[PDB]
Design an enzyme around this catalytic site. Structure first.
Site, PDB file in Angstrom:
ATOM      1  N   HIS A 115       0.814  -1.228   0.000  1.00 54.25           N
ATOM      2  CA  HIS A 115       0.000   0.000   0.000  1.00 54.25           C
ATOM      3  C   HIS A 115       0.835   1.260   0.000  1.00 54.25           C
ATOM      4  O   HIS A 115       0.311   2.319   0.333  1.00 54.25           O
ATOM      5  CB  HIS A 115      -0.893   0.094   1.201  1.00 54.25           C
ATOM      6  N   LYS A 118      -8.960  13.376   6.946  1.00 52.25           N
ATOM      7  CA  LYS A 118      -7.974  12.326   6.794  1.00 52.25           C
ATOM      8  C   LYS A 118      -6.837  12.585   7.756  1.00 52.25           C
ATOM      9  O   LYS A 118      -6.838  13.610   8.451  1.00 52.25           O
ATOM     10  CB  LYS A 118      -7.437  12.268   5.377  1.00 52.25           C
ATOM     11  N   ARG A 119      -5.925  11.621   7.846  1.00 53.68           N
ATOM     12  CA  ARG A 119      -4.794  11.667   8.749  1.00 53.68           C
ATOM     13  C   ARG A 119      -4.069  12.977   8.533  1.00 53.68           C
ATOM     14  O   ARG A 119      -3.821  13.347   7.397  1.00 53.68           O
ATOM     15  CB  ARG A 119      -3.838  10.459   8.515  1.00 53.68           C
ATOM     16  N   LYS A 161      -0.338  15.428   3.184  1.00 53.58           N
ATOM     17  CA  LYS A 161      -1.765  15.527   2.847  1.00 53.58           C
ATOM     18  C   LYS A 161      -2.151  17.003   2.639  1.00 53.58           C
ATOM     19  O   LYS A 161      -3.189  17.314   2.102  1.00 53.58           O
ATOM     20  CB  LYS A 161      -2.658  14.850   3.900  1.00 53.58           C
ATOM     21  N   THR A 212      -9.370   5.645  -0.433  1.00 56.10           N
ATOM     22  CA  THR A 212     -10.742   5.200  -0.485  1.00 56.10           C
ATOM     23  C   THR A 212     -11.785   6.222   0.007  1.00 56.10           C
ATOM     24  O   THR A 212     -12.957   6.072  -0.319  1.00 56.10           O
ATOM     25  CB  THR A 212     -10.875   3.895   0.251  1.00 56.10           C
ATOM     26  N   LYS A 221     -15.880   7.283  -1.408  1.00 58.35           N
ATOM     27  CA  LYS A 221     -17.089   7.514  -0.603  1.00 58.35           C
ATOM     28  C   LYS A 221     -17.766   8.819  -0.973  1.00 58.35           C
ATOM     29  O   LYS A 221     -18.993   8.863  -1.151  1.00 58.35           O
ATOM     30  CB  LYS A 221     -16.767   7.469   0.883  1.00 58.35           C
TER      31      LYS A 221
HETATM   32  C1  LIG Z   1     -12.344   5.485   4.560  1.00 56.51           C
HETATM   33  C2  LIG Z   1     -11.760   6.027   5.847  1.00 56.51           C
HETATM   34  C3  LIG Z   1     -10.375   6.245   5.960  1.00 56.51           C
HETATM   35  C4  LIG Z   1      -9.345   6.029   4.825  1.00 56.51           C
HETATM   36  O1  LIG Z   1      -9.350   7.116   3.915  1.00 56.51           O
HETATM   37  P1  LIG Z   1      -8.112   7.792   3.233  1.00 56.51           P
HETATM   38  O2  LIG Z   1      -8.454   9.403   3.151  1.00 56.51           O
HETATM   39  O3  LIG Z   1      -8.394   7.598   1.701  1.00 56.51           O
HETATM   40  O4  LIG Z   1      -6.762   7.319   3.585  1.00 56.51           O
HETATM   41  C5  LIG Z   1      -9.872   6.724   7.189  1.00 56.51           C
HETATM   42  N1  LIG Z   1     -10.675   6.971   8.188  1.00 56.51           N
HETATM   43  C6  LIG Z   1     -11.995   6.753   8.098  1.00 56.51           C
HETATM   44  C7  LIG Z   1     -12.835   7.033   9.322  1.00 56.51           C
HETATM   45  C8  LIG Z   1     -12.594   6.296   6.925  1.00 56.51           C
HETATM   46  O5  LIG Z   1     -13.935   6.033   6.850  1.00 56.51           O
HETATM   47  O1  LIG Z   2      -0.175   5.776   9.950  1.00 58.34           O
HETATM   48  C1  LIG Z   2       0.195   4.527  10.507  1.00 58.34           C
HETATM   49  C2  LIG Z   2       1.729   4.371  10.618  1.00 58.34           C
HETATM   50  O2  LIG Z   2       2.224   4.940  11.850  1.00 58.34           O
HETATM   51  C3  LIG Z   2       3.486   4.625  12.453  1.00 58.34           C
HETATM   52  O3  LIG Z   2       4.384   5.706  12.246  1.00 58.34           O
HETATM   53  C4  LIG Z   2       4.048   3.243  12.018  1.00 58.34           C
HETATM   54  O4  LIG Z   2       5.471   3.139  12.091  1.00 58.34           O
HETATM   55  C5  LIG Z   2       3.583   2.676  10.674  1.00 58.34           C
HETATM   56  O5  LIG Z   2       3.789   1.284  10.739  1.00 58.34           O
HETATM   57  C6  LIG Z   2       2.086   2.891  10.448  1.00 58.34           C
HETATM   58  O6  LIG Z   2       1.612   2.371   9.204  1.00 58.34           O
END
Ligand SMILES: *Cc1c(COP(=O)(O)O)cnc(C)c1O
Ligand SMILES: OC[C@H]1O[C@H](O)[C@H](O)[C@@H](O)[C@@H]1O
Ligand SMILES: C[C@H]1O[C@H](O[C@H]2[C@H](O)[C@@H](O)[C@@H](O[C@H]3[C@H](O)[C@@H](O)[C@H](O)O[C@@H]3CO)O[C@@H]2CO)[C@H](O)[C@@H](O)[C@@H]1N[C@H]1C=C(CO)[C@@H](O)[C@H](O)[C@H]1O
Ligand SMILES: *Cc1c(COP(=O)(O)O)cnc(C)c1O
Ligand SMILES: OC[C@H]1O[C@H](O)[C@H](O)[C@@H](O)[C@@H]1O
Ligand SMILES: OC[C@H]1O[C@H](O)[C@H](O)[C@@H](O)[C@@H]1O
Lengths: 824, 827
Positions: free
Chosen positions: A362, A555-556, A561, A666, A670
């Site tokens: 991934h 998102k994260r 990002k 993903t 959505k």
């Molecule tokens: C689908 C989903 C994700 C993954 O989304 P990405 O923006 O594409 O990495 C992460 N968190 C939640 C709560 C989701 O529903």
């Molecule tokens: O976002 C998740 C990521 O966080 C941490 O830094 C981990 O080392 C990695 O394994 C993981 O995938």
């Protein structure tokens, strides 16, 4: 008023109400007098679980009798979210349960809002795994997930005036009504110790620590099918024997309980911090524990389906899927189990292993692939190191035997990097060398893998690599989160078979210009927006205008990002609004901006970004002069539940990562599926969505992946010329208009030309002008309502390809070689 | 073949089988394919718990509506044993459940043998508390027990070549199907910290550690009544919020989880070892936690039954609540109730003290004055500062009383006061705090209660001459005759021509007129014989020794302690063995074959106790494997003595040994169990032996040994070189030292019986001195056993005299004279 009456198969309002009340009484977890919302949820969830058990048991007995090839998916995360509505919905009992609860004096929503998310994962890796489970169940495939039963997740995000603070999750502090413990399903997992060499020359891992792995099942119901599979989760436990009374009674409590502590550690949190040696060991313990428990459970089932069996059947009856490098250890562990516990020779055991395991990558990143100190691996898992070393010794001999032309490349192709400073085990190389298949998760990503990252491996095994584009489940993500909208679809497609054949959504195209349908679509979006407005006030005290444009980035939180770009864009728009006369203000498009996500606790700038968004929002939202036209909100504790509230109400969503950095996305799907338009880079899954919905319904901007290296080299050389609006946004953030917090050190990451952690590596500054120009387009397009509504319908109408059903079917045919096994 | 069908009120075989199968399916804890014994048990237990919940909820609602005075019993232990048979039995569903299980392909016994004992206690203190619960329920009294939910008990005893080894109990490692968690019943309990003084002069305990107490209910059903009460147990938990992620993610796991660890510590084991400061603090944490959780729960219920206006008047509190402290462990309920009244609820000292003093009563179970708990004032200030302030004010007022109204006791204030301000080891005397504060103090047998008034607490009796009382201990005839000895119970019901004795045990006297009747003796012989086959079977299963059912079954089971004199017994055995090796075969055929069975547990640190268990085993290895004498004698150590074990041993027993040094035992409830099941006693005139012997008659009891008043005199003779030991006593010792029982040096153990003076020596417990009259009582037992009619007669009169020993009698006395509570039947 209503009487307790058990009916494990209740399927009408009266029966269901009786059964709910039965569980309230005879499965109590509380004082009997009060029957409030919480007690109602657990009561309802137990009513549904009665159904789920029946079906799970039928499915287990059926697979047992047929003995099909079975797939088992190994993941370190699963984002299961809330289960209530999904269960009601897959059992097709919406009307009846809703009526039942009303006879008991509750609205289903009320009760639904009490449920906690199963904190068993964190990101898209985990939601992918979960959407896959739903598709495996609905396609009637013989497949399971295996994971770890994390108690406390990653963390719950609180927002204080100091920004993000992290607190443990509590979803198990009372109990979870979904899961089914299996106290007969226990397997031992070892750590440390050493290798005993037996007089006959066989080998055995001995000594060290032994923990017990205890299985719990979470049933997964399929749509319109009896098939109900499992997500089987593992809890690490010590035995009662492992507490040392002598030491407890000496007052030495930590020594006394040190085996219980080591067990607890493994299922405390996801991705425990690993700067130290202790954390690196704990991470490896987690990975090993999942692989070893699961493989022992799989082998046990292989044998249980025997009708007296020969090992050569094993890879015709079993498929194992490694999701990223985390479950790499399944390779040597399966080898250990075959040769040591079951007495097979290397060649036979390797043939079996190589045909069983496949690997899904991934990651675009070269250095993000897991590498472990050879020193740690020997300490923790000595038998596995022996096996890993023999795998490398044979593979290297193959390259000398069969491919003398790659001799000079052996020091990067091998699994063991014997670098004299940092000797490590390269886990991706182990995966690729061992698996019969490697796939990526989007056509561009899979091509980068074959061309750049794994070029020489593609050379040796030219049929090993594949693509399998990611997808989502249209049950959870349209049918169940957006029921108004789903009814419209079913009405205009004149069928509801799209819920398992999502390509039928293309029939909406012919209606994109239709006034009645656009009118119906407006209303549903308007209604979903009222709800979102409600939620936002509830969870942040901020009152948002439902008539304004809903613009969402969730998102994260990460520099790549580019939340920072977004938020600087916002600072700019705000400055310009303060500077306008009221007559100019009335001509702009009102917008509510919403940002959410979590920062890794130790990631300084990510934490500074969250702080920034909030500080901006405090000032902007409380300004009477411009808050009619702009508001900014940080949505806290982003998780599946939150996504379920945001997506149906969204109009624009932002997927704006630096090009080349995302393999997929993903959440993109959505949004697209729910008629939300995208502003995005030509990256990851944006490439495929944009193909499918059509370029005219998508706001592309920014540098392309092939351009990025060139553009960094221009920065290194002093050739970068920043846009003045970009610099105006920065300065205004530094003027201290957003409070006392000095944002200088954050903004420093965008200054200079060279050096780690500066020089705007992610091209925020460079893409800002084309980003802001795409935002102006979005404003113009939004003013033309018919055109906007048209685009939104064509967005949904093109989302066919993004079904997890398509993805799993592809996996089933090309990789696993499994087929439908319907339960009669 | 049988179908799942929920029927929470099943009362016939078919309905019950359906409901059991319902639970196997829809309350699973295992893979579905196999339905083996273990799964059958959990399935059956859940079927019964459906009944138990209905009745518990009815009882809660009724007590809520009537708002009677309610008693709450505080104990650090409860020996609940297995619950299955007791539940089936109190619901009167023996026939139906047994049938139900047979349609499912199982014998009830088979399933009952799968159940684990609830390891919630250790000794007679705990079994008393449990029998009391059964009697509260069956007399329809509004009363509850409150305890701690120990995970691991004291320990499970295994016997290795090393002797006793201790391993943790596992009765919760899967789950317990009896208990009902109550997640809304959580109360906070603090430790350490300090006292904030407010400007208005109110005070408040702040800071330190806070743990959550979580209630679990274990329903207790009464016999022939709907009334079902609670043993409510507390689990100490930390909140999720209390794990420090930052530290966890830095790799500092123990710091991260230190609050969770301190909570797990409280409910790990009973009586955690306390040589160190850490252990002393942990013990106190346990005691406080039980008192503070329970009192908060009680105050909450007092308020919840208000029908009225606002909060109800506090002066009602001691008319609606009675709290019983079992030994000194729950002494902290005194200052804690005071803290809750004054600080949380705003009452003044005098009003709060009036309430408190009328609410609490104290039960003593201990003869010796140096078994009563004393704690360092320094530790108390550290752990529980607010309590110390209050305890100090109690002592300051009590001392002023002794000057304002009893100037004649001035010179005794330094032993009467609660605080001992000794300059080396200053302590809080907890029994003195109990006696100063309680409206009532009682002992547990008429002699014990008289010692308390006359020796131990004489001067307190002087100030409050109506404070002290007796309440003789008892046992429940349900668990201990009706359910453990069902064959025998049918005989009783047949000959008494009624079954009302199961709740009116005095009716057993109607058996006396038949003690000479040969049909009844013949029926009694059969029942004992049958119970003995079973015991024989069990003993092989758990020891690997095959015992003769025709030999005499002689049993000593209780806590291994020097004052219980297992060593005397075991030396008696070594003697009998030596004599059997020395006889010709013709002399051997004339003796009475005997199987000796000894059991119990030694505190892990108690060296000599551990040595005694080792000794018993070594003797057995040699004796049991000797072809020359094992037809006439065998010796067996029964491991892991607990309620289940007692339930197997008592119905098969013929002689039981209660041979403590006179004066040392305040009671002895196992005595009563044996007597009630027709087992004759060889014993000292001590504790409950005095009363049993009165009740069954002297001619049906093997008395021996010095009496309590004689013991001091006999020690002083030893200190002065006047003691002349019996030669058979010395012959037994030497033979143990000759090494005939293996390589283990027993010299240091036997050293406790040598010399004339000095700590740990000089045969303080008069083993050597009572040996001759002991061995002579053993020769009488042999002669009495040869006369079968005379033996059977004695056994029947034993049962026939056991009326007085019912826990129903004890609890009724407590209800009337102490608690002032009355029957509150659930319609
Ligand atoms: C689908 C989903 C994700 C993954 O989304 P990405 O923006 O594409 O990495 C992460 N968190 C939640 C709560 C989701 O529903
Ligand atoms: O976002 C998740 C990521 O966080 C941490 O830094 C981990 O080392 C990695 O394994 C993981 O995938
Ligand atoms: C009447 C009075 O009762 C309570 O006071 C108790 C303390 O709670 C207890 O700690 C103990 O205090 C001693 C203290 O620890 C020691 O350090 C100090 O030097 O001396 C104290 C006495 O020896 O004993 C006292 C009193 O015996 C309550 O805490 C008080 O709130 C309570 N006062 C009430 C009563 C009235 C009128 O009756 C109001 O005027 C007053 O404001 C109110 O607080
Ligand atoms: C009744 C009982 C006791 C009681 O204590 P004694 O000192 O023997 O009279 C102890 N343990 C068990 C298992 C009991 O049943
Ligand atoms: O910018 C990339 C990386 O930089 C920082 O070191 C962060 O702490 C880390 O988690 C992140 O992935
Ligand atoms: O077994 C009962 C007794 O055992 C121990 O000696 C404890 O120290 C004591 O508190 C307890 O009452």
């Amino acid at each position: 008023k209503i009487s307790a009456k058990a009916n494990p198969e209740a399927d009408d309002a009266t029966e269901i109400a009786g059964n709910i009340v039965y569980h309230a009484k005879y499965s109590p977890h509380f004082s009997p007098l009060k029957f409030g919302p919480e007690q109602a949820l657990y009561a309802t969830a137990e009513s549904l679980r009665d159904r789920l058990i029946q079906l799970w048991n039928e499915t287990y007995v059926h697979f047992n009798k047929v003995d099909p090839k079975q797939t088992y998916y190994l993941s370190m995360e699963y984002l299961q979210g809330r289960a209530l509505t999904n269960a009601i919905g897959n059992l097709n009992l919406q009307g009846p349960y809703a009526d039942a609860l009303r006879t008991l004096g509750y609205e289903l929503e009320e009760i639904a809002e009490q449920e906690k998310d199963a904190a068993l994962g964190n990101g898209g890796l985990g939601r992918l795994a979960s959407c896959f489970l739903d598709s495996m169940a609905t396609l009637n495939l013989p497949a399971w997930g295996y994971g770890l039963r994390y108690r406390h997740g990653l963390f719950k995000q609180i927002i204080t005036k100091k920004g993000q603070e992290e607190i443990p999750e509590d979803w198990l502090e009372k109990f979870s009504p979904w899961e089914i413990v299996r106290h007969d399903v226990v397997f031992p997992v070892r750590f440390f110790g050493k290798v005993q060499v037996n007089p006959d020359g066989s080998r055995k891992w001995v000594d060290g620590d032994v923990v017990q792995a205890l299985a719990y099942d979470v049933p997964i119901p399929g749509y319109g099918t009896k098939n109900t599979i499992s997500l089987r989760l593992w809890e690490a436990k010590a035995r009662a024997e492992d507490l040392d009374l002598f030491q407890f009674n000496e007052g030495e409590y930590e020594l006394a309980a040190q085996l219980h502590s080591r067990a607890q550690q493994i299922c405390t949190v996801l991705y425990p911090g690993d700067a130290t040696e202790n954390g690196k060991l704990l991470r490896l313990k987690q990975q090993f524990f999942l692989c070893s428990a699961s493989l022992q459970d799989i082998i046990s089932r292989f044998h249980e389906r025997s009708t007296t069996r020969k090992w050569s059947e094993f890879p015709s009856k079993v498929a194992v899927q490694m999701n990223d490098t985390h479950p790499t250890l399944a390779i040597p562990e399966l080898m250990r189990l075959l040769m040591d516990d079951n007495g097979l020779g290397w060649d036979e055991a390797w043939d079996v292993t190589s045909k069983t395991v496949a690997y899904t990558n991934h990651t675009v990143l070269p250095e993000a692939l897991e590498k472990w100190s050879q020193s740690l691996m020997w300490k923790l898992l000595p038998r596995h190191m022996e096996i890993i070393e023999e795998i490398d010794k044979r593979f290297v001999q193959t390259i000398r035997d069969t491919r003398v032309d790659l001799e000079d490349k052996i020091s990067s192709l091998s699994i063991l990097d014997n670098n004299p400073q940092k000797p490590v085990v390269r886990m991706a190389n182990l995966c690729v060398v061992s698996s019969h298949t490697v796939n990526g998760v989007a056509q561009l990503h899979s091509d980068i893998l074959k061309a750049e990252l794994f070029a020489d491996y593609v050379s040796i095994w030219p049929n090993k690599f594949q693509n399998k584009t990611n997808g989502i489940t249209p049950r959870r993500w349209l049918r169940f989160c957006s029921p108004e909208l789903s009814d419209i679809i079913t009405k205009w497609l004149k069928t509801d078979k799209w819920i398992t054949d999502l390509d039928l959504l293309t029939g909406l195209r012919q209606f994109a210009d239709n006034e009645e349908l656009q009118s119906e679509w407006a209303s549903a979006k308007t209604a979903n927006k009222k709800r979102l407005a409600q939620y936002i006030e509830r969870v942040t005290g901020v009152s948002i205008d439902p008539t304004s444009l809903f613009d969402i980035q969730v998102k994260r939180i990460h520099e790549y990002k580019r939340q920072l770009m977004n938020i600087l864009g916002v600072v700019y728009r705000f400055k310009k609004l303060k500077e306008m006369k009221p007559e100019e203000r009335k001509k702009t498009v009102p917008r509510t901006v919403m940002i959410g996500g979590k920062a890794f606790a130790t990631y300084t700038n990510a934490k500074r970004i969250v702080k920034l968004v909030n500080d901006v929002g405090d000032v902007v939202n409380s300004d009477p002069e411009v808050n009619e036209y702009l508001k900014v909100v940080f949505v806290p504790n982003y998780n599946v539940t939150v996504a379920e509230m945001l997506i149906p109400g969204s109009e624009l969503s932002q997927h704006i990562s630096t090009a080349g950095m995302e393999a997929s996305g993903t959440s993109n799907m959505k949004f697209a599926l729910n008629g939300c338009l995208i502003i995005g880079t030509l990256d990851g899954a944006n490439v495929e969505i944009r193909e499918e919905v059509g370029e005219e319904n998508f706001f592309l901007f920014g540098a392309t992946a092939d351009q990025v290296p060139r553009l960094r080299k221009e920065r290194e050389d002093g050739l970068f010329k920043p846009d003045p609006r970009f610099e105006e946004a920065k300065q205004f953030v530094k003027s201290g208009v957003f409070g006392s917090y000095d944002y200088g050190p954050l903004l420093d990451s965008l200054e200079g030309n060279t050096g780690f952690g500066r020089g705007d590596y992610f091209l925020v500054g460079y893409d800002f002008p084309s980003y802001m120009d795409a935002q102006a387009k979005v404003d113009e397009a939004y003013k033309d309502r018919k055109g906007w509504l048209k685009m939104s319908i064509l967005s949904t109408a093109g989302s066919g390809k993004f079904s997890s059903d398509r993805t799993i079917a592809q996996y089933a045919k090309e990789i696993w070689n499994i087929e439908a096994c319907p339960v009669p």
